[PDB]
């Protein structure tokens, strides 16, 4: 189905392919961007510890602060995903 | 010019009108959503302490965790703004 493109990453190379997995499952399951975003957020809070934040959309700009090595931003198809750890 | 609509807020009623100000100035100054977002982020990091995160866009869903009383989400015209404190 969808094509994973990483645009900016500061994160273990494994957690990246992991972040794509959690998102690919989320895209397969949910439709609303808010919903997709909670799935990913919750899964990362579960696996790696709190506190993840996730933004899912086709149009937004961001400026966030993230703990070192805990930040990814990528596209799955035409939806884009921002997933960082701060808190 | 633009019409400020608050959609969800957990934040002092004053910091809200403040968040609209920081955004209205940001919209007047910058054009790219990423840029607008950094202006607001940086200003809040300045006034109220670290650590703010800001998302600016016309299309995105979010799921974040924020410190109590440090969260706003609102529209300025057709752009929407998410501004929370976690970290």
């Amino acid at each position: 189905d969808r094509k994973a493109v990483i645009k900016n990453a500061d994160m273990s190379e494994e957690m990246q392919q992991d972040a794509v997995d959690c998102a690919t499952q989320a895209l397969e399951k949910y439709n609303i961007e808010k919903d997709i975003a909670a799935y990913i957020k919750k899964e990362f809070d579960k696996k790696y510890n709190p506190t993840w934040h996730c933004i899912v959309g086709r149009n937004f700009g961001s400026y966030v602060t993230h703990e070192t090595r805990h930040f990814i931003y990528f596209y799955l198809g035409q939806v884009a995903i921002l997933l960082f750890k701060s808190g | 010019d633009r019409k400020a609509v608050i959609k969800n807020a957990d934040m002092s009623e004053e910091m809200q009108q403040d968040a609209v100000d920081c955004a209205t100035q940001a919209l007047e100054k910058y054009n790219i959503e990423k840029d607008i977002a950094a202006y607001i982020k940086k200003e809040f990091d300045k006034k109220y302490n670290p650590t703010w995160h800001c998302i600016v866009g016309r299309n995105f869903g979010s799921y974040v965790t924020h410190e109590t009383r440090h969260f706003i989400y609102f529209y300025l015209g057709q752009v929407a703004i998410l501004l929370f404190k976690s970290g």
Binding site: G57, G61, Y63 | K34
Partner: peptide
């Protein structure tokens, strides 16, 4: 701890 700007294409 670092900081990142991101913008959709």
């Amino acid at each position: 701890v670092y900081t990142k700007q991101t913008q959709t294409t």
